[PDB]
Amino acid sequence: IVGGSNAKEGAWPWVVGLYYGGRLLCGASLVSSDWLVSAAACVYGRNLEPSKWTAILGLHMKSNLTSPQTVPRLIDEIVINPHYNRRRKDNAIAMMHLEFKVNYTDYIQPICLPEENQVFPPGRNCSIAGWGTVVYQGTTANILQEADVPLLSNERCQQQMPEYNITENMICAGYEEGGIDSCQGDAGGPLMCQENNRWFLAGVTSFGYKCALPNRPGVYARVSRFTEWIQSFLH
């Protein structure tokens, strides 16, 4: 995807890979002991047969999976956010059920949803993850890819990217000069910010116009307004 960096061993315990038919396709965040939050676009149309979705929690590399640090689970129920339209690729948020219960350990850690009346300032440089590729026309990297990108306000993103509606339902994060990007490829990782050693879920990554293209930041799905919807299923 050009610009990404390999994540450290166990540096992202809140990222769980998803396999459909034996191939990694998307990622998700561990919100509770029985729920995962992933992009709705990468799982749209495949929710009719949850048995074909296998969730590997604590996934670091695709070389091996039968390790104590990795928790395999079978998805039973998939819920798609009603506001998703697939026309403007907005509100691409979906939830998956992890059987009955999931424990927690060093390599399996939960995630933090945004609090009430929490606003991310523009220009805030937050981290993104996902198993991206070295280049768009290349092979998917075997090591988890991480990057740091600054946030962009919706008003400025409309002027910089007059291609999608975007609006306030999703937030643009990236570099106006390009160079570093991880939205493309089979990453499926979430955009995460820093809140004084508290890993708040800033958002879920989504479609990108072009990797490392200047003035084309990754338009990731904002989850601040969808915190109540997630907590409704969680609680």
């Binding site: 540096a11 506001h83 339209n85």
Partner: protein
């Protein structure tokens, strides 16, 4: 004198030359030992240098099966300026053998000729030296391989008529493959591989028994260049007429051009075709006029598969061209690209119209379909859409159901793939049905009755109290927030404990619902374990310090007690007067604290 490994000495043992250079065709040893007949043990017939103008040669073991893989090579040498004609009578072999005929020796042995599994007939080489190699790559004793005869003839006594006229039934006649091409025009008897492109029969004979030339039949994945160069033609006082038959049937047919190369380096190409013209031989007739010697070049840029081009029945006749008896070729029709867009979709559906299909269920639905159904009914009703048959595709198209009553439609269900699908209910009287399909794999479609009702998807309630859960199971007091699960949805454990008069999720007064009435919790028996239990029941974090502030409920407040089963004992007894009520003070949940190796950039 000794030679390094990989090289061998000559007969005189004075010069060391590479093993691959032995018997190649060019003299390397000072005495010519590398081309000597005795040194080059042909085994086939014992002769290596065919200095004679005519003769015969046979493959390995003419009367015996070829149990041993023996490679044979012959060099035919004649006077300078004379051509050599090779006649082949039988080449019906079960492959595993390679017959290579090369014009000249040395760097000219690249792509002159390569014939296998088919009798080449007559092959003419316009050089004083001809190399014939029979290579056996395995110990296969199916056939001897060939038995041919050769002669010689002058290369320039031929007039313009003979040098061009060729039915290709007995080889390439006098045409010479261009050495600058990336490949060569393969000779095929009958239909070629990869059908639906290229000719299926020979033009000269009219059936598959004939022989013609065309592009290579292999599934080449790269663009190459091929070309046929004609012999020089002496100038004539009258312009001539060139007639030919060309077969251009294929989706990726790039180009096919005819050029004239002369001493003036001036090209005035008069014939050029491109695209698909159909599975039929088209007649091309042109008039040639020139004052000096010139060569006619048939050039073709071969594209990927489905780009086969064939040529047959090429001739040149002295005199001005007569009236052509065949029309100009016509391009193969293609699907119209004039704004295909979509199918538009049907109109709005109402109560009287119930049964509907995508476009036409029995046959198929048009590609790039975006059918929109606006299901509406009477106010206060809901829509049930049960599908009698659902035989869509995989991850190509998907039927989407959107809740109406507003512009911001709410997704209800996405259906795809073969097999029956469950019924879908709407929360209002307006529903949107979208058929999102690509331009490929358009199956029969779906079909639904589109029924209407009142609370069709709502589970049936029970009258006369009988408290119901989300699924509708009657749980008045059996499963009323007591840790017992009976409801299918698991809603029997709903939040019967909450916080009131609070500015946030961790502020206010804790209230418990015993059966149907909320009562506050007193501070008579408040402990750290009870605080942690309250935090857990309210979905909170660590049970930090909390103290009572002021009471609000002076009636039968709920007293909290500890129990071994992990459930707080609630006593609805007023054991104290004006007792201060505990104010909820709990920490945030133990979320994903950064205990990993993730770094923070201080910029």
């Amino acid at each position: 004198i000794e030679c390094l490994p990989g090289s061998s000495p000559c007969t005189d043992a004075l010069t060391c030359i590479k093993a691959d250079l032995f018997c190649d065709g060019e003299v390397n040893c000072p005495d010519g030992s590398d081309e000597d007949n005795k040194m080059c043990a042909t085994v086939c017939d014992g002769r290596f240098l065919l200095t004679g103008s005519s003769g015969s040669f046979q493959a390995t073991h003419y009367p015996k099966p070829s149990e041993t893989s023996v490679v044979c090579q012959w060099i035919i040498r004649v006077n300078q300026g004379l051509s050599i004609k090779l006649s082949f009578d039988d080449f019906n072999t079960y492959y595993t053998d390679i017959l290579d005929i090369y014009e000249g020796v040395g760097s000219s042995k690249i792509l002159r000729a390569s014939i296998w599994e088919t009798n080449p007939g007559t092959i003419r080489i316009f050089s004083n030296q001809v190399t014939a190699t029979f290579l056996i790559e395995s110990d296969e004793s199916d056939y001897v391989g060939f038995n041919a005869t050769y002669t010689a003839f002058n290369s320039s006594e031929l007039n313009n008529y003979e040098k061009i006229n060729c039915n290709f039934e007995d080889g390439f006649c006098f045409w010479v493959q261009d050495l600058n091409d990336d490949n060569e025009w393969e000779r095929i008897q009958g239909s070629t591989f990869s059908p639906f492109t290229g000719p299926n029969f020979d033009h000269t004979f009219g059936n598959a028994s004939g022989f013609y030339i065309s592009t290579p039949t292999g599934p080449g994945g790269r663009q190459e260049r091929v070309g046929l160069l004609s012999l020089p033609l002496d100038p004539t006082l009258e312009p001539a007429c060139l007639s030919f038959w060309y077969h251009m049937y294929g989706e990726n047919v790039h180009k096919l051009s005819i050029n004239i190369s002369n001493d003036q380096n001036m090209e005035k190409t008069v014939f050029q075709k491109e695209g698909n013209y159909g599975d039929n031989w088209n007649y091309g007739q042109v008039t040639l006029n020139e004052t000096v010697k010139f060569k006619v070049a048939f050039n073709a840029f071969k594209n990927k598969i489905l780009s086969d081009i064939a040529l047959d029945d090429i001739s040149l006749t002295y005199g001005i061209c007569n009236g052509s008896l065949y029309p100009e070729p016509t391009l193969v029709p293609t699907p119209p690209p004039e704004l295909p867009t979509d199918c538009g979709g049907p109109f709005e559906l109402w109560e009287p119209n119930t049964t509907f299909s995508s476009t036409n269920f029995p046959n198929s639905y048009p590609n790039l379909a975006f059918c929109v159904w606006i299901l509406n009914a009477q106010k206060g009703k809901n829509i049930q859409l049960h599908f009698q048959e659902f035989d869509l595709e995989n991850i190509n198209d998907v039927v989407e159901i959107r809740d109406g009553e507003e512009a911001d439609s709410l997704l209800l269900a996405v259906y795809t793939g073969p097999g029956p699908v469950k019924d879908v209910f709407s929360t209002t009287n307006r529903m949107t049905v979208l058929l999102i399909t690509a331009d490929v794999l358009a199956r029969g479609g779906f079909k639904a009755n589109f029924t209407t009702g009142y609370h069709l998807g709502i589970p049936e309630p029970c009258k006369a109290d009988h408290f119901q859960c989300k699924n509708g199971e009657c749980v008045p007091l059996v499963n009323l927030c007591d840790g017992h699960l009976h409801c299918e949805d698991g809603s029997d454990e709903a939040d019967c404990v909450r916080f009131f008069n609070g500015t946030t999720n961790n502020n206010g007064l804790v209230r418990f619902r015993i059966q149907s009435i909320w009562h506050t919790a007193c501070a008579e028996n408040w402990t750290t374990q009870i605080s942690n239990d309250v935090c857990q029941l309210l979905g909170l974090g660590s049970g930090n310090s909390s103290k009572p502030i002021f009471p609000t409920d002076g009636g039968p407040f709920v007293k909290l007690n500890t129990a071994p089963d992990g459930h707080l004992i609630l006593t609805p007894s007023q054991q104290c007067l004006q007792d201060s009520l505990i104010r909820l003070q709990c920490n945030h949940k133990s979320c994903g604290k950064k205990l990993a190796a993730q770094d923070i950039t201080p910029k």
